[PDB]
Amino acid sequence: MTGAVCPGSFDPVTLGHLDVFERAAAQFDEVIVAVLINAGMFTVDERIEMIRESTADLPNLRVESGQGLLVDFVRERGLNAIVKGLRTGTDFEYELQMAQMNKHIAGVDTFFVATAPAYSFVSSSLAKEVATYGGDVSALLPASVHQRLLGKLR
Amino acid sequence: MTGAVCPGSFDPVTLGHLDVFERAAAQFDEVIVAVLINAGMFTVDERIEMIRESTADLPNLRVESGQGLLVDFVRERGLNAIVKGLRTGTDFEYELQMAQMNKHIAGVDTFFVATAPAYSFVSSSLAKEVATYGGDVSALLPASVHQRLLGKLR
Amino acid sequence: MTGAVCPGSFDPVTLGHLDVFERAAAQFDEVIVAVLINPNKAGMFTVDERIEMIRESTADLPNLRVESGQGLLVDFVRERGLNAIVKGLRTGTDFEYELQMAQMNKHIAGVDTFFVATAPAYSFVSSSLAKEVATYGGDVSALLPASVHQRLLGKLR
Amino acid sequence: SMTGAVCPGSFDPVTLGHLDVFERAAAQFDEVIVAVLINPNKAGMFTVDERIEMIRESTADLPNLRVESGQGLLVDFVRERGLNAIVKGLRTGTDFEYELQMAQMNKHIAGVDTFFVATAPAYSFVSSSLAKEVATYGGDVSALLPASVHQRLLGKLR
Amino acid sequence: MTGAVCPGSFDPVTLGHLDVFERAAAQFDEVIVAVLINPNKAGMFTVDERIEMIRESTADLPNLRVESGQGLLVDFVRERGLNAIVKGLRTGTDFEYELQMAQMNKHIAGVDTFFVATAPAYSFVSSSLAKEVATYGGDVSALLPASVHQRLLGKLR
Amino acid sequence: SMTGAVCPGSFDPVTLGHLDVFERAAAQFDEVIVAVLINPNKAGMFTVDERIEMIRESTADLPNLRVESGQGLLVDFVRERGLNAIVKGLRTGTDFEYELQMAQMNKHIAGVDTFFVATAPAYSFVSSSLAKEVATYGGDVSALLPASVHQRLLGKLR
Numbered sequence: 001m002t003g004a005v006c007p008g009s010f011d012p013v014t015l016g017h018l019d020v021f022e023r024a025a026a027q028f029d030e031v032i033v034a035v036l037i038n039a040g041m042f043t044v045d046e047r048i049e050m051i052r053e054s055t056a057d058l059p060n061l062r063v064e065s066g067q068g069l070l071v072d073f074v075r076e077r078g079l080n081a082i083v084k085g086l087r088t089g090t091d092f093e094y095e096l097q098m099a100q101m102n103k104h105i106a107g108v109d110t111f112f113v114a115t116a117p118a119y120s121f122v123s124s125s126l127a128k129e130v131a132t133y134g135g136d137v138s139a140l141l142p143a144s145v146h147q148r149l150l151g152k153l154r
Numbered sequence: 155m156t157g158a159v160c161p162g163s164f165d166p167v168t169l170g171h172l173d174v175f176e177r178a179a180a181q182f183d184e185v186i187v188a189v190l191i192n193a194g195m196f197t198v199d200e201r202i203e204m205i206r207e208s209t210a211d212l213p214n215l216r217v218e219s220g221q222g223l224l225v226d227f228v229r230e231r232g233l234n235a236i237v238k239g240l241r242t243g244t245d246f247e248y249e250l251q252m253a254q255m256n257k258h259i260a261g262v263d264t265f266f267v268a269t270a271p272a273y274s275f276v277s278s279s280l281a282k283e284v285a286t287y288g289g290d291v292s293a294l295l296p297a298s299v300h301q302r303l304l305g306k307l308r
Numbered sequence: 309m310t311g312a313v314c315p316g317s318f319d320p321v322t323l324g325h326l327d328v329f330e331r332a333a334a335q336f337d338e339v340i341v342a343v344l345i346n347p348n349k350a351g352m353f354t355v356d357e358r359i360e361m362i363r364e365s366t367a368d369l370p371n372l373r374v375e376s377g378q379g380l381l382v383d384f385v386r387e388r389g390l391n392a393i394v395k396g397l398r399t400g401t402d403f404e405y406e407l408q409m410a411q412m413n414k415h416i417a418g419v420d421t422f423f424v425a426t427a428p429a430y431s432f433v434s435s436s437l438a439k440e441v442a443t444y445g446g447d448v449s450a451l452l453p454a455s456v457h458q459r460l461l462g463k464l465r
Numbered sequence: 466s467m468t469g470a471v472c473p474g475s476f477d478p479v480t481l482g483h484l485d486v487f488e489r490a491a492a493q494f495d496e497v498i499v500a501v502l503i504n505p506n507k508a509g510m511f512t513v514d515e516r517i518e519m520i521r522e523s524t525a526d527l528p529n530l531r532v533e534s535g536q537g538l539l540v541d542f543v544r545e546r547g548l549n550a551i552v553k554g555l556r557t558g559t560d561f562e563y564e565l566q567m568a569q570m571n572k573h574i575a576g577v578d579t580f581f582v583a584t585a586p587a588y589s590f591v592s593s594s595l596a597k598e599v600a601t602y603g604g605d606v607s608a609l610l611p612a613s614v615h616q617r618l619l620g621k622l623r
Numbered sequence: 624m625t626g627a628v629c630p631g632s633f634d635p636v637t638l639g640h641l642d643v644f645e646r647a648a649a650q651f652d653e654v655i656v657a658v659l660i661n662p663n664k665a666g667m668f669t670v671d672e673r674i675e676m677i678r679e680s681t682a683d684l685p686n687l688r689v690e691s692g693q694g695l696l697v698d699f700v701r702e703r704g705l706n707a708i709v710k711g712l713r714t715g716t717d718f719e720y721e722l723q724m725a726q727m728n729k730h731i732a733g734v735d736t737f738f739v740a741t742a743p744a745y746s747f748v749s750s751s752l753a754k755e756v757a758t759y760g761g762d763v764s765a766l767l768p769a770s771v772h773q774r775l776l777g778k779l780r
Numbered sequence: 781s782m783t784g785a786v787c788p789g790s791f792d793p794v795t796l797g798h799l800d801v802f803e804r805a806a807a808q809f810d811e812v813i814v815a816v817l818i819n820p821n822k823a824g825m826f827t828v829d830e831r832i833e834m835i836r837e838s839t840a841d842l843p844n845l846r847v848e849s850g851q852g853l854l855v856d857f858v859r860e861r862g863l864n865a866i867v868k869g870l871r872t873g874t875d876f877e878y879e880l881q882m883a884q885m886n887k888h889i890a891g892v893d894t895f896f897v898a899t900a901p902a903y904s905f906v907s908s909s910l911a912k913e914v915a916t917y918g919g920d921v922s923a924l925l926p927a928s929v930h931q932r933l934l935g936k937l938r
């Protein structure tokens with residue numbers, strides 16, 4: 001009965017995120033994508049739907065929203081692992097502090113997975129920014145999400 | 155039927171390694187510690203025995219030796235995940251190259267886990283070096299290993 | 309007479325900070341902990357509360373004293389006849405931004421900066437993360453001086 | 466003439482670190498355009514005219530360099546001038562990682578290349594932001610800024 | 624007339640190298656790929672084989688030429704009337720050691736260094752890792768020019 | 781007198797970056813000991829006497845600094861002199877991470893503290909090893925080494 005939680009704001013979910021979800025789903029019996037309720041572009045409901053749309057082929061993955069401490073979200077679902085994607089060593093050091101804190105306060109482990117090379121430079125933020133000024137980000141987002149993004153801007 | 159491989163030379167295994175093994179064993183149904191056959195201090199047999207001694211309380215962990223490509227070792231056992239411990243962002247960038255190569259050539263995923271804070275500075279190499287000049291490393295190694303190390307030096 | 313200044317906002321002081329204070333006090337004839345007064349971003353504790361929490365935690369360091377200030381840190385340091393800063397570091401990224409600051413402070417005022425690695429046990433605590441965790445009912449009592457933890461619970465109610 | 470590069474920034478104000486980069490780009494490309502980014506939603510310390518004047522006064526010895534402002538996507542500014550190279554100065558490994566993301570995005574969306582150059586050691590620690598902050602509280606940054614900038618900065622602060 | 628030198632051992636040249644060569648050739652009037660001759664560590668391919676593999680892979684770059692040399696790189700660069708080096712970079716750690724070298728080369732000879740980020744697809748390939756993987760029967764054909772891959776298989780038998 | 785620190789290295793040869801660190805330590809501690817590490821299993825370019833002579837000649841203006849060689853564990857060298865501080869110069873974040881490991885180990889095994897100081901910008905890029913390599917192939921490193929070193933280095937190479 002293994003399992004992991006994949007956390008984020010996912011505003012919107014990118015192909016980099018989806019790659020991490022797919023890898024987590026391949027290695028744990030159960031995966032929960034945890035969507036933070038927190039000034040964003042998409043509502044929590046929209047963010048959840050976009051993730052659900054993009055993960056239809058992952059039968060052991062579900063999507064849920066929450067707030068407060070991530071470790072409480074994880075433990076209240078009977079799990080004690082987080083899976084997070086990483087691009088750089090700079091990312092590793094900041095996330096490292098959080099992972100060690102989360103282990104300390106709740107015994108929750110964090111597993112980091114290296115970004116697929118093709119998505120090393122995509123982030124929800126840069127994708128939104130580039131799209132806003134007319135740049136083509138269609139290759140960096142699920143087809144679903146891309147059309148939804150065009151809608152919000154226009 | 156989940157599983158992961160924890161690779162290394164483990165010459166000797168440290169408490170930092172053992173911490174990673176325990177976390178992997180807690181999150182995967184099956185863990186295999188892969189001991190590289192490669193100028194070291196302990197023979198492969200000694201390294202295996204020291205790991206087996208220190209992991210007696212982990213029923214779902216086994217220890218095996220091998221050489222060649224790690225991804226072949228992993229795939230030949232029906233698995234496609236590696237679990238590796240990390241201390242720094244410098245570690246992340248070098249290991250990152252390897253993880254991406256391993257994914258490319260064999261579809262094998264790599265999950266990195268942050269070192270426990272108390273073992274952030276221990277490595278097989280520094281422990282051997284410090285012990286050689288008379289420094290006390292007893293708190294950094296399994297009790298087992300520590301006595302074996304004293305034997306090799308004296 | 310040797311000496312160094314240990315700067316910060318200390319909102320609140322953590323065991324990571326205390327570890328740096330103790331190491332500085334062991335190596336310099338005098339240490340001054342310099343608590344930043346910031347007009348804009350008012351934090352959780354007042355400057356007086358922050359000073360009191362540091363003094364409680366450093367009661368056994370007779371050569372360390374606690375003072376508040378604002379503006380340019382190197383002015384604070386030189387006004388007290390000193391020309392060294394001691395700061396704790398956790399990561400390589402920490403070293404890069406702090407490096408820029410140290411070189412700037414050396415350039416503009418001839419004040420040197422000595423960095424010390426945090427004890428492994430406190431490598432992940434920070435004032436901001438401790439407050440955030442505590443706010444949602446996480447237990448950070450092992451990461452803070454005893455008196456700080458008590459005061460922090462009070463401010464949260 | 467033929468080869469060319471764009472040196473982007475907010476240059477609010479330009480520093481000696483920036484000037485070093487401009488000089489090195491101008492020595493290696495037939496033309497260099499210093500691209501002054503203006504955020505239409507947030508005024509910097511200096512207006513666009515002031516920023517451009519300060520750069521021109523300290524680049525008078527570089528005949529193949531010119532200065533232009535813009536906004537929006539950098540790659541559009543570069544391509545609309547028939548170029549496809551950006552030259553940017555870098556101080557640290559942390560500098561490299563975030564600029565890396567933007568360089569790969571810019572290549573992806575517009576085929577524009579980015580060349581990074583290590584800043585001169587003497588300027589490894591000046592940035593526009595740190596210079597402004599230090600000057601605000603009275604520190605001496607005169608050796609870090611061109612003559613075209615230092616007293617104009619002090620004037621803004623006073 | 625602008626120009627730059629792209630240095631390396633290229634044992635063998637990879638698609639990561641080729642990507643850098645193409646970008647340099649697109650931005651400079653001339654590019655010289657400088658192949659290191661090393662008396663001590665003899666690699667897998669001879670200098671002549673390495674040059675031939677680069678020339679095959681750069682056949683469509685008319686302003687790029689391939690030459691060998693040894694000793695101080697900045698001497699090679701200045702002897703050819705140039706004063707720029709172009710090098711590919713993958714990581715922040717790469718930037719730190721290469722940074723030291725670039726500043727040294729600028730100091731001793733006035734030669735500048737321009738760094739370019741590898742294309743994402745080739746960020747993990749290196750000559751050494753490709754050889755190691757190939758030695759044990761791993762498939763690196765997507766990471767090397769077609770002709771290099773053929774030659775590499777031959778040397779392994 | 782009372783406070784004190786040890787500045788360790790192989791100093792094969794000492795560079796201006798090292799000297800900067802020595803001067804800064806000597807300004808902040810009552811006594812400073814430069815600890816010259818000798819590997820009994822591998823000769824450097826310079827013998828122990830040569831290394832010590834080159835350091836002494838370039839630290840004559842520092843009355844509270846002395847120079848001693850040793851081998852084995854640094855923390856034993858430090859503690860046997862009644863001190864418990866190491867001062868080391870650092871150039872980069874990568875420098876910090878590996879030195880971090882050794883500093884935490886040294887504190888663990890012997891209670892010895894390590895203080896790091898940022899090298900002066902002008903020397904951010906000299907190391908003993910790179911100076912030797914550049915000089916070997918004829919590059920000019922005269923501005924990176926004290927007078928006590930440069931021509932002795934050229935002599936070794938010739």
Ligand SMILES: O=C(O)Cc1ccc2ccccc2c1
Pocket residue numbers: 007008009034035036037065066067068069070073
């Ligand atoms: O990443 C964090 O640590 C903050 C975070 C992110 C997502 C969440 C989702 C559900 C509940 C709490 C959450 C916290």
Ligand SMILES: O=C(O)Cc1ccc2ccccc2c1
Pocket residue numbers: 161162163188189190191219220221222223224227
């Ligand atoms: O870490 C690596 O990539 C090299 C390595 C290490 C351990 C191994 C154990 C068994 C078989 C191959 C192995 C390869």
Ligand SMILES: O=C(O)Cc1ccc2ccccc2c1
Pocket residue numbers: 315316317342343344345376377378379380381384
């Ligand atoms: O670290 C800085 O440069 C900001 C700072 C922090 C603490 C201070 C304490 C007293 C006076 C000035 C201060 C500045």
Ligand SMILES: O=C(O)Cc1ccc2ccccc2c1
Pocket residue numbers: 630631632657658659660691692693694695696699
């Ligand atoms: O990169 C370096 O500094 C070493 C190197 C590499 C290639 C070379 C090619 C020709 C001549 C000297 C060379 C030096």
